[model samples]
Target chain A: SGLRKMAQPSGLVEPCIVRVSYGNNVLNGLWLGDEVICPRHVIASDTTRVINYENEMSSVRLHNFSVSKNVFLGVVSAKYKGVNLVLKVNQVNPNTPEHKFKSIKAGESFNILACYEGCPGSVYGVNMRSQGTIKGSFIAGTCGSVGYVSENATLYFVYMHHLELGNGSHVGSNLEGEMYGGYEDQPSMQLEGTNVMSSDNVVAFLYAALINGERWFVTNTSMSLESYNTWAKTNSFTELSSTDAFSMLAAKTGQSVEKLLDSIVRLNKGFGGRTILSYGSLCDEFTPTEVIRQMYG
Target chain B: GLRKMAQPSGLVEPCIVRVSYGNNVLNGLWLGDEVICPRHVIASDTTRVINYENEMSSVRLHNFSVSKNNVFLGVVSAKYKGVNLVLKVNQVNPNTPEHKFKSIKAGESFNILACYEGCPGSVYGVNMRSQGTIKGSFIAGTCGSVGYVSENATLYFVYMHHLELGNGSHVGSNLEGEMYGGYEDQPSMQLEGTNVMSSDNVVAFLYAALINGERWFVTNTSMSLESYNTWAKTNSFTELSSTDAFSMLAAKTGQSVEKLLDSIVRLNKGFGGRTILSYGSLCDEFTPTEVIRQMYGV
Candidate 1:
């Protein structure tokens, strides 16, 4: 019952996922745990003011005189001529809400950005690349739901725990999960060597590889497509659609997916498709019959 | 402690065991809560009384085969004309003891009746058949130690939770455990399908069915040669002995059971045979190569 004292925070806090995009590249992954402060000159001088409302719902005042070119800047908090205005966005405690900016002067907007613990996404542009003011959305949701859109394609932040599976489908929990792609389109072979190897969908990919008789690897996202094609070229693996892959397996084995699924189920019993994917090398050695007999007999 | 209240006694609490018999029938599976009372007429009247003993040591009573005709009936507790004689058949309960019957009448016998929460034995006769009088041991022991003897074959009550499996015949605690018959003798396919399907052994049966290209249903009790063969014929199954089945599977696959078992263990990582039996339809579709590739890329 001694619940009076507030618990003190300690150590380095782990950053959550955030989606960021610059130029052609978009990163939808954990943010590197750091803050970015934009230049203060972007706003008008004496015209800048912090408006504080007398009501329970308060607002900030700003006094600014001159205006510079419109620019997007990440801000922690701001002050006009010495009065404290906004506060840094602290998502650490669920009970505390993010500090919202009261109002923005003309030709200016601010973003509250923080970095994450791991680099599961792509980083675009050089460290200090200056560019013309651009307009887009920096959507950040839960770690797995965050996404960033560039001029080219949209990338969703995927954590290893809530992994993205076949054709962009996401499932799983904690370290048991693994990241994947192609959930949106038909780049069936793009998943060959990347972190997709660590995913539950690895079974689906492995089955496809065996049908084509090829090898795969566990590598990073950037090298996945190249690594897969390299192996495919060396092994004479004709790039086949996922449907074509299943068709080939059915044709060779003279069994349908239903039949094959049954055999796999019978072979593994209570285990689902994920169990097969969990075993890297051992699963590759045995044939279906062999696995079945080994499992059942 | 609120433990000072005296326990009350009552006569003729509702009994629970129900016996059903038919062709190709076997129901030696563990029963849910039920009590069976042997006929009271088996012993003479005016020859009943309760006896209490302070002895703490315990004895396990096992009936022996008296003869071809005279069979072993269940043990009972009761008194003779006027004597205070007690009989002990300790079942390991703390407060109440099985030694409540004292002495027997001149040539009379009484069975110690009990209500089991579950049935793990065979009940003779039909769904509603009344026979003169039959005798068989009513064995009730610790969770895993119940057995029954029928005219045809002996069946043990095996619960999936306390399943016995593998070479050493180890028991397990859950779905992870499988029931295997051959752990003792020539690998008895003697898996009563009702509990077997519900058990991890389903993988084994499903695999067997896949290998033979057939389907299997979960059903009951002592399968007579005629009943099994009849069912096998109707279902496109060959009535091979469990030994024959294993041998046939080995011969057909050109692989030893050990080799196959090893492969399965490797494929599924930490699981054993029962895992194979639990997923029937999902398991029947893929080939060894397909499954391996699906499980692990080439």
Candidate 2:
């Protein structure tokens, strides 16, 4: 149980509505920790809105949003007009009378779209770029089917746990429930330089392919944040005494690393959006042999 | 048919072993275009023996001592060794039979081993480390069952393929069947810094696990060539700048990349010998996420 009290503010509230017509909620007081004045009837205005929520516990509480009927209630913790909302919504559209589909299985595929103005701008695109198609074999206990969809970014199926996809080069596993569909695509070689940990299965496959003399292209939308970061980390190798990475690349590729770099450079030039970056996961403890073999053969 | 004649003015006559052996007129070749040199026979004091043969191609033919029921033919093309050999023999066993198990609709796994004695050394260790299991399920005819067994330094599965395992990491795949496995225990993190391609469901799952963050100690036979190479390549990361690799380790163990690297450095300190490196393809790509989550969860 929680306590709620209301008090009238003395001064005239600064013209509440900011955006005129949107009719959004308005904030009366400066955001601060508990102590003072409470406003009467906080009106939903047309401009940016702020809803102050109180929690008795010191720790932050995570809120889960489920698909009700066909509507999903997305929690707006912050404003979203000029800002881009990158919400990693772990959701499952339950099997209802109208929406009857198999429960999401591990590595399954599905779509999560955020529609505004009736025209959808890819909110979060999940594709099984790395693991191929969702296994489709539904988990024993779960209901709705699981899988991924894509536009640019790849979202891979990892059993549940709280994870931030774009933060690092690799996605961590929640390791609870099975996940379906995720970002699967090849990352650019240039971006692969710096982000050691972030890489999609596709990028790993591509790197392996390039080394093994396989011709490949990025068919998936774009690179995952992890892949992009890994690329950045990889290209930073040029900074280290210089020749070591090149030599290492050469030895690893079974060819001259310098030669491989040159090839990569030429390859990058072919793609308009290409840059010199690194593209492998340093977190991958296994050798890149399989990746390479897949790419090469 | 091609015909060839021996040169007349050759100083040392080469010994040819095309002669029929025993009641069975068996050619001393297993598979591929094999060349038998005439000078192979060597008379070492009392006993006459064929010491060496100029071997090349996919399979080599060699004459090893034979038994009545079975001719222990030295089929030395490289793929036949260690665990792989045993597995292959098991697969080919008339009794056991290579019955295709639709364990999972789509994915691959493998367990390869290389056994060599003496020390001229082998050129590529791919075959030695190429034992695995594979499985896959796709829309009919999308890409049918593709399997391959070779004796090269590399294992070849179909490209962009994915695989899962009970004891190993899961692999992801592309439409082209090109699949990649990650680190041993962790299948999500693709193994970085090597040029080996994944083909066949088995190879895909292997790479998927290795690259994804499965530690070799958990999913692989200890200190195999593949494992050592993984160690060497990972150690080489110190020479590079940036901490992206740190993130994959982070993603794998559900720890930060920094913490993962710290653990790697610490764990790798005195790691030697055989321990988790031999659990061949254990799962399929279908339930990679579920299997991995289950494994790491407990």
Candidate 3:
């Protein structure tokens, strides 16, 4: 509903300022009331004279009157306090602006509103409450602007008023100025805290945490990532990857991950968190790569 | 005909009663030979029966007594060898007399046998072991006697055989001279130590004992008799009557005394007596009356 649906011209129009006003005050402030309305640019316009304040005297004032078929201007008139107020809205073609990388200073605060087509949208507020270096990308636009990149590099617009943090497709910045982004080198990825890395066999690292955090599961099974790795090298797969490790291990033991997870979950249900077991069981039927994607993707 | 009959109209009759004997001395005595009477007596006769013996004769007497229309007498007679003997018997009328109020001196003892018309009879013994005035009424009769009095004033004879503390309906006396009697003065009562008083609103006093004894109940409801008293006054009936105020409290609270008791019992059911609420909401409905009574009787 928000995007305009109309046939576009064969040539791209350059971007320019489009000021929308009421009474004598210009809505030029970066933050309007509680929202960032300044960065809003007119995407389409028609020659419909909408007179909102016809009962009072008001006139439309237009400066720099050069107009073309591609460039559009629309007038909205209204009445306030028994006085006529006319609003002039214009659209112009401007050049494509450069996308700059914006870094955050420690102890600074900002806000971001992310918009994606046919996808979910989110708003984020960042208070650089700690001393840290935060880096990201930004693109200024006509009228209101768009800034910041996403974790998946999926093309999306962001309303970045107050220089706050931004969340987008393949890159984003958090309140701590911690930059998280998707990588093209590895099609699969996972997150450790705020940092994203290429997906690999994290079974060893995961088992390391479990061994220290919960000793009883491995204590009884007499299992370790090192031992599994060693067994995998000598037996089924010489080069084991996280995506196929479980399948290879299952091939060696002649058991499914569901059976393994069930046994493990039964042994540790009372001791470990149920969510972990539930997620593990939920992803058990899929490949290890699909399971990791389902969890950390 | 047992006594000297027509001859006793003017002058007191004088008669010579005798005995007969033989060498073998058969058992024989006589008013005279014509009567061959072995047994007889003369009225107003303190005179002894006399008999002469031959060859060591002796006499035996049986069933001898003097008589009137309401009185009679006869003599039992027997004989032995070679001895003169006289035996006499008499009868008298003891007038009907008023019942007496009997008391016992210290260290003295007496017994009374009580007999009822159809009820189970009982025996009592009273001992004046201490210097105390023990008072009660007694009735003397032909075969049995009644003592003291019952609520209905039934003359069930009390056999005052032992002067023992007697338990009866209207009147009784313990060995300690505690006299228990039913009077119109007080219909219901309770005993405190040795003293008895009229039954009135004992709920407050009963609650006072609970507040002092089982302070745990009041301790949580805000410790003190005043607080419990205030709470009780505002929330419950103040004029609780009945010796068992706990029972009254239970009735007012619409809970059984057993339930209230169970709650308090549960409170102290394990550890030493704690507050009832500390146990649970199970006892929350009870007042101090129930709590105290649960701890001790009213």
Q: Chain B, TM-score, each prediction? A: 0.23, 0.22, 0.16
Q: What lDDT tens digits, residue by residue, belong to model 3 across residues A198-222?
A: 1122232232223223223333233
Q: Each model's C-alpha lDDT?
A: 0.23, 0.23, 0.25
* Candidate closer to the true structure by lDDT (higher is better), 1 or 3: 3
True contacts kept of each: 0.00, 0.00, 0.00
Best of the two (2, 3) by lDDT: 3
Candidate 3: regions farther than 4 A off: A1-297, B1-298
Of candidate 3 chain A, the 10-residue stretch with the lowest lDDT total is A1-10
All models, DockQ values? Answer: 0.01, 0.01, 0.00
Docking class of 3: incorrect
DockQ of model 1 vs. true complex:
0.01
Specify the highest-TM-score model's number.
2
Roughly what TM-score does model 2 have, to 2 decimal places? 0.21
Candidate 1 docking: what grade? incorrect
Q: By the TM-score metric, which is better: model 1 or model 3? A: 1
Model 1 native-contact share: 0.00
Full-model lDDT, candidate 3 = 0.25
Error of 3 at B275 (Å): 53
